[PDB]
Amino acid sequence: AKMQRSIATVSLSGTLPEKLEAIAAAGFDGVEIFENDLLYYAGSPRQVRQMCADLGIAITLFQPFRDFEGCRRDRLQKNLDRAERKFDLMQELGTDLVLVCSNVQADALGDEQLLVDDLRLLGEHAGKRGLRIGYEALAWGRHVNTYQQVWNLVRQADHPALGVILDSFHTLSLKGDPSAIRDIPGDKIFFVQMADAPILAMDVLEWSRHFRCFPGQGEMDMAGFLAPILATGYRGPLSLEIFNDGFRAAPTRQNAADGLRSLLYLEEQTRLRLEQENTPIEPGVLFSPPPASAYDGVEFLEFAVDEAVGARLGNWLKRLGFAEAGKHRSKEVQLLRQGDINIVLNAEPYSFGHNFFEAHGPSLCATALRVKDQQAALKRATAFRGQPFRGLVGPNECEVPAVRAPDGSLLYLVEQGTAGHTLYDTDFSLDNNATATGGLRRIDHMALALPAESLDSWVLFYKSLFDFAADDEVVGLVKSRALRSQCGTLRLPLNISENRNTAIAHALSSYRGSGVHHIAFDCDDIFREVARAKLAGVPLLEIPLNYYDDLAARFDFDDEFLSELAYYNVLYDRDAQGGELFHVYTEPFEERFFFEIIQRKAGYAGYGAANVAVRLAAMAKA
Amino acid sequence: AKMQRSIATVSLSGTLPEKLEAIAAAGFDGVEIFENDLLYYAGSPRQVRQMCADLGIAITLFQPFRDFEGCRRDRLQKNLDRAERKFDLMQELGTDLVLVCSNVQADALGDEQLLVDDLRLLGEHAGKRGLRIGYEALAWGRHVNTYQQVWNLVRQADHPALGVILDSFHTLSLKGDPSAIRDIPGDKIFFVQMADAPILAMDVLEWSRHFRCFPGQGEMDMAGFLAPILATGYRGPLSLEIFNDGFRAAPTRQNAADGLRSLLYLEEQTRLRLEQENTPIEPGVLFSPPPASAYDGVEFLEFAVDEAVGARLGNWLKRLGFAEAGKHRSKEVQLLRQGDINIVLNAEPYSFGHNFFEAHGPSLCATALRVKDQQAALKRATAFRGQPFRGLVGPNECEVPAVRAPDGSLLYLVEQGTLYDTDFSLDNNATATGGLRRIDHMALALPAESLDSWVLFYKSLFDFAADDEVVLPGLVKSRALRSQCGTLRLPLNISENRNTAIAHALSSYRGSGVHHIAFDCDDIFREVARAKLAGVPLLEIPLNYYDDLAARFDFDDEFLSELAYYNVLYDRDAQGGELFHVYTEPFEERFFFEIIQRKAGYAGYGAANVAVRLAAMAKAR
C-alpha cells in the first residue's frame, strides 16, 4: 500500500474549496489545513470536513501552532487556552494531528528540562482529548532549530500523543545530516513535509518564505532525506509544504498535479536510493514506474510554418548546408537533411501544425526523440500522468506514439528504424540525389526560453517523465540552468522569456513569446563550416576586435591562429582540462530562434556561457 | 434580461473539462469552442455537449474557420467539404454558429462580386443544414480587414444564414470608427467578441497574438465599441476572446472569474455611455450595480510587524515627523499620527496581522479607506463578486466592513465619524514634529502576471480610473490608477520574479508588496531640512542629474542650485505645474518613503526621476 500523500493548502492559491477540489482531482489522499485558509473561508470548519469527505480526501494535519514551549510562565495558561481552542477546531475539522513549530520569540525560555515539561504538558492536554502533537523545528528557532533537538525533547517527554514532524527544507537548508533519523522509532515520527529549494546563501527565513518548490524542482537531496525516514519503519503521511501567495495567481490545478507528480518521482528516486544502499523497502510502498528508455538523440525537428515563412526558413537551412531531401506525398510538408539532422517543415493548413503556427508564429511544434524502447518511454510518461496520443489520434499525425509537452508541442517516440524504409521512405518522396552541402552532423543541444512561472513545471516534466538530470553552469547572470538525458545524447538548456508586461512597459514593438531559444549543431572543422556558411549567406554575427584582443591577453596562443578566429568571427572557450570550444551564432530567424555551430575539442563539455554577454552585444547592433 | 455572456476557450489554459468547469463556475452563460481544444480533448464532441449541458452553459459559437472566400477556384469544392465536416462537428456539439475569419492567404482573390458569391454559396450550404455563418474581419486580412467591408459583403450576399461578427480588437487596433455599426440591422450581427489591449506601435498580428486582455485591463475604448452595437437592437451573445498562450501559468478559474467581472464592468460603462449620449437602453439588460462611493483619502495604514521590527519602523516614522498617538487598549498595536496621516503598527500575535507578517515580513496588511457611503461601497464590491467581511468576522478585526484584496490584504470601508477613540488610548498631547500633511499616493510592486487582475479589481469594485504616465528614456510607460476625484492614487510597478533572483546570485529578494508611500507638504525645502536634522536617510543626488535639468528646463534664480543643495528632485509639466519630491532609503530592503510638493497643478508622479532614484539607492550599497 502506498503512503497517504497529502499537500498543505498554503502550497496553492485560490479559495479553500478550489484548493480542496484541485487537491482531490490531482489524486492526493490527504490535505494539511493551513489555519489562515480557514480564516478567509466564509463557511464553517465542519463544512470543510464535509467538503473533504465528499471529495474523498482526509484532513491529515492542522497547522500551524506557533510559540508554545518556553514562553513566560504568567502566559502559560493563556497558551494552553489557545491550544484548547485549536483542539476544538480540529474536532470540528475531523483531524487529530496539529503541528507545533518551535518557538521563535527572542524572550523565549531555553532550559532543556523546562521545554520537556512544556511539551509533555501539551502532549497530556492533546492526549486527554484524543489528539496528537507533532513538534517541528523551524530552521530559525530561538532554541530548537534541528530535528535532533526535537527528538531529544520528544524522547524525554515520553508521551504517546507527542511526536516528531520532519520538514526537508528546515533540515537541509542548514546542511543538516538526515542520517540520524534512522535511530528514531518509526512510530514517534508523526508527519513528513517535503519541500525542495535552490541552494542560496540567504537568510533561511526569507529562503524558506519565497523559494520552496516541489521535490525535483530545486537542488536539495530529497531522496537522501526520505531514505532515513523509511528505514525507521515509518509509513505515515508523505506531504508537501510550499509557501505561495498571496502574490499572485498561481494555477491551482496544475500546481496540485505537479505536486502529486513530484511525490511519485520522489518515491521512485527514494526507492532507488535504498536499493543502492543495500537496505531495500518492501514492495508496493514506493511508486515503481517503468524505467526510462535509452535515447539516441533527436530523430527530427518539426517546425510549424506557412508557405511564405516555411520557404524562408528552408532557405536558411540550405544556406546552413541542409539538402532538400524531398516533399511529403500528399501534404505541404518539406524534409531537409544534413548528417544525422532531420528537419521537417510543416506548412499543411487546417491541422495541428497550422493551429500551432497561428497560435505562436514560426516555431518548433514537435520534436521526435530517438528512443530504444518505445513502449517503455510511453508507459513511463503515462505512469507520471502525461498526456499520450496514440498515432493518428488527435494532434498526433505521425504513426508512432506522442507525449504532450506542457505547452502545445508534442514529443514523438520514434523507435529505430527498419532500413526499408524508415519513417521518411514511407510518407515522403525522397530525392535520392539530395546530399547535403555542409558538414553539420548532429543536434548537440537545444535551448528553450520559458516563462519564469512555468520553468519549474517544465523541469519536473522532463526529470520525471524522461529521467533527465540537472546540468547547470555557474558563470550579471551567473547561473544558467540546463537539463540532460542520462547518457548526454539530449541536452536542453532553459532560459527565462521576457514577460509581456515588460514589453509594454519598455514600449517595445518586437515581442515574441516563449519557444525555441536556439538550436546548436556540431561539426568537425569550425573554420570550414563558417567559411561555407558565411559565403552561402548565413547571417553569422560580427564579433568586435576587443573580444579577440581580450583573448590575446588571457590565452596566449599562436598569433597566426588567433587572427584567423578574428577573421572568421569565431567565439572561444576553454575548460580547466584543456578542452576547447569553437562556436558561432547566427542572427535570430525573424526575431525568434537563432542557430549555433560548435566544434568540441579534447572533451570540452560546457556551452560556452562565458560568451553570452558578447553574443547579446553583437545581436544588439541591429 | 441580460445578454448571453460567453468566453472563448482559447482565453484560458488547462484541459477542456477544466476550462468548461471554470467557465460555468464563474457565472458565464455560454462558451466559444476553439477547435484546437477539441483536438487535444480525449473525449468525443458529444461528450463535450454533455459536459456543457451538465454545467448549464450553452455552446454559443464554434471557431475558427479560416481562409474561405476568395481562395483560388480549384480549392473551392475542397473548402466546401471542409465546411461540411465542420457542419458535422457543430451538430454533434449542439451549436449552430461558426466563425469564418477573413482570408489571409497571399494568393487569395479580392474581386468584390466573387467574394459575395463565395460567401453567399457558403451561407446557402449552412442554411440547408440549419446553421449560421458569422463573418469576421481580421485586422491583417488580405482583402477584407474592416467591419465596414464585412457588412458590405454580407449585405450584398443577402442570405439570412450569413451575418456579421464584430471583434473589438480587430476594429480598434486599426483605430476604426465603430459608430457606423449603428446603421447595421441588429439581426444581421451574429456575435460580438470583446477584447482589450494596450495601444502599441507594432504589427497587428503579433499585437493580437500576445497582448489581448479583458475589457478594462488595456487601453482601448471598450464601451465606445459596444454602445453602437446595442443601438442596433442587438441583444445576442456578448463574449470574450483573448489568446492564452500555451506556456503555462494563467489560473483557469481566476481568469474565468476576471473575465466575467470584466463583462459586468463593461456593461455598466456601456450603460453610462449610452445614457450620456441620450440613447438609453431598456432596463435589465446591462449590469447596474450601486455606483461607487466618494472617497476622502486614506483613513489609516495598517502594517504587519513584530515588536522588534515594529519599534524600528516606529523610529523611522518618528524621524519623519510622526507622533506616538497612543497604544491599543488590549493588543500590541501602536498608533502614529502626523497631519491627517494615521499609521497603525500591528504587532498582535496569533491574528490576521501575525499571519500576514509571517507570510510576507514587514508589510502593509490593510488600508482603511475614507468612504462617504459605506454601504454603497460594500454593496458595489459584493456586486462585482469581491469577498466582503463583516466586522469582527474572519480576518477583519475592525468593526467596519472590509473587502479582501487579491493578495489577502484588507480594505476597510470607514465612514467619517471615533474609530481610534474606541480601541486606542489616545495621547491628547501627541503633536507631530512635521511637516507631512496627507498620503498623496501609494505604489504597489506586483507580479507581472497578476497586475492586470489588480487593475480590473480596482477599476470595477471601486471605480478607479487609468492614470498612466509616458516618459522618454528603458522604462517608458508607468501604470497607475486613481480615484475619480484623485484622493486615492495607486501607481503599479512590476516586482522581480523569484527565478531571476535565482538566475543571478542574489541574497536579498523581497518579492511583492508596498512599493513606496508618498506624503505631501507645503515646503519641500523646509521638510528636507527638518528631516535631515531628525535623521531621515534621504538620498543624495549626483550633480550630473542637475546638469541635465539645466539643459532640459530654463530656471529662474539661483533656483536649480538650491534644489541640488537640498537633494530635491524636480519635474515640470507642460502647464507650468511643478513637482518637488525626495525619497528615503528603503526600510529593510522593502518599501521606501517619499515627500512631495505639488505646486502649479502638477498631476503626475515624477516618473522621469525613477532612473535617478535607482542609481542613488544602488550607490548607497
Ligand SMILES: [Mg+2]
Ligand atoms: Mg514545515
Ligand SMILES: [Mg+2]
Ligand atoms: Mg548553445
Ligand SMILES: [Mg+2]
Ligand atoms: Mg475574434
Ligand SMILES: [Mg+2]
Ligand atoms: Mg511616488
